[PDB]
Amino acid sequence: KPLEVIKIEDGVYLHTSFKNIEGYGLVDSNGLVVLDNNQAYIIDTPWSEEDTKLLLSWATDRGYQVMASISTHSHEDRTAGIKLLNSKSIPTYTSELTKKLLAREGKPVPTHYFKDDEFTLGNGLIELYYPGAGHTEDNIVAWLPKSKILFGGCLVRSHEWEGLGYVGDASISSWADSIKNIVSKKYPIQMVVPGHGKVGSSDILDHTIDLAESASN
Amino acid sequence: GHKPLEVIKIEDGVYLHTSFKNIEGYGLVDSNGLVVLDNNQAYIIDTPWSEEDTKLLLSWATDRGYQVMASISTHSHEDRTAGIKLLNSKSIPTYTSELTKKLLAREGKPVPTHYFKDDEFTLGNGLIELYYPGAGHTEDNIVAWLPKSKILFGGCLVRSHEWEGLGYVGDASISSWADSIKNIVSKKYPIQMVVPGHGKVGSSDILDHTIDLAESASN
Ligand SMILES: [Zn+2]
Ligand SMILES: [Zn+2]
Ligand SMILES: [Zn+2]
Ligand SMILES: [Zn+2]
């Protein structure tokens, strides 16, 4: 089934990609599109090239210019559309580490990267922060100061889940600390968006800390 | 990155087998069946999710000196039937309901060599009791009751407490699902444990949870 895009705040839309697993059912993956006058910014590509093309059409059919994407770690559900965005001359961004992990895997790389633990896109529309290893070594989060939404990506676990999920690339013993570094920013969080599953409140941070500590033991 | 079949004992003469698929950008998803033993005779309730995992389950059994007498698949979906072709190639009897068999045929998938026509059927001389309670997860889903161990294999018609919804409903009859679960209840089996098609083994409470979720999606 195709990409779904639904409004979750003024100028903020959740995009969800799906894969249909024979014998199991549909699984899904979230990112955001953030709108500012006539400019759009994508936080995580959709999960496939085809879905990324649908996301671009969504924006441009509405008269927006897609200014940039940012991918919040190197896995395919965050980065599948980088190649397409690059082919359309849309700036793609990741952290330096994420870029280097993609390059090391022989995957298309973003055309731009940032070196520090913090970076901003869209002149403060989106504030990126690397809190430490968790779901992966390179996972970053995005804070949207206007809408008070934290896109936690795959580092955070929605309440629908009673486990950490895939941990093949995880640093389980650092994960709780990395969430605590997010808490220490004292963002006035109204909503937290996960990489997989339903939008929640700031309590998703506590839920994740607890899943992390349990797994550590 | 294939993670192999896992087999774990859950009662005397009853083993849970779990197959896994590793979905890039997501992680591992899984699917359960059973192996039920009677002396050195083994019966498979649902095949593993792939040919290779079915091979591994066959090797599990034969390495332990068991003869695999038959498999029974509890509906037509791939997670229940993937191994039918391979079992057939080794002359191991494969069973489904008549409806499941015909759905497979219609889809041009490998068909079982055996099928039962009634709403009830037994394998192994009272070892496994099969019952069709009605449509739910699919039009053809059946359940298996194990008298000796007091285990109900509910397969994908039942929802573990871990799940907040009915799951995939592309092939479902949401309106009939609660009723079908009530039909199971009406059997008055002395259930000690209920095993789902996807997720953790639980207690007879799984049935009430499923009725709840069915009613809610209906409403
Ligand atoms: Zn990931
Ligand atoms: Zn993810
Ligand atoms: Zn099914
Ligand atoms: Zn199933």
From TrEMBL, chain A:
Positions annotated to bind Zn(2+) 4: D77, C154, H196
CDD domains: IMP_DIM-like_MBL-B1
All copies of domain Metallo-beta-lactamase, residue ranges: 28-196
One Pfam family this sequence matches: Lactamase_B
Binding site for Mg(2+) 1: H15, S17
Cofactor: Zn(2+)
Catalytic function, reaction form: a beta-lactam + H2O = a substituted beta-amino acid
Localisation: Periplasm
Residues that coordinate or bind Zn(2+) 3: H73, H75, D77, H135, C154
GO biological process: antibiotic catabolic process
The keyword Hydrolase is assigned to this record: yes
Chain positions recorded as Mg(2+) 2 binding sites: S95, D138
InterPro entries registered for this protein in UniProt: BlaB//VIM/IMP-1 (IPR058199), Metallo-B-lactamas (IPR001279), NDM-1-like (IPR050855), RibonucZ/Hydroxyglut_hydro (IPR036866)
EC annotation from Swiss-Prot or TrEMBL: 3.5.2.6
SUPFAM superfamilies: Metallo-hydrolase/oxidoreductase (SSF56281)
Binding of Zn(2+) 1, residues: E22, H73, H75, D77, H135
Binding positions (Ca(2+)): S69
UniProt keyword annotations, A-Z: Antibiotic resistance, Calcium, Hydrolase, Metal-binding, Periplasm, Signal, Zinc
Record note on quaternary structure: Monomer.
Family stated for the protein in its record: Belongs to the metallo-beta-lactamase superfamily. Class-B beta-lactamase family.
Protein's UniProt name: beta-lactamase
Lineage, opening ranks: Bacteria, Pseudomonadati, Pseudomonadota, Gammaproteobacteria, Pseudomonadales
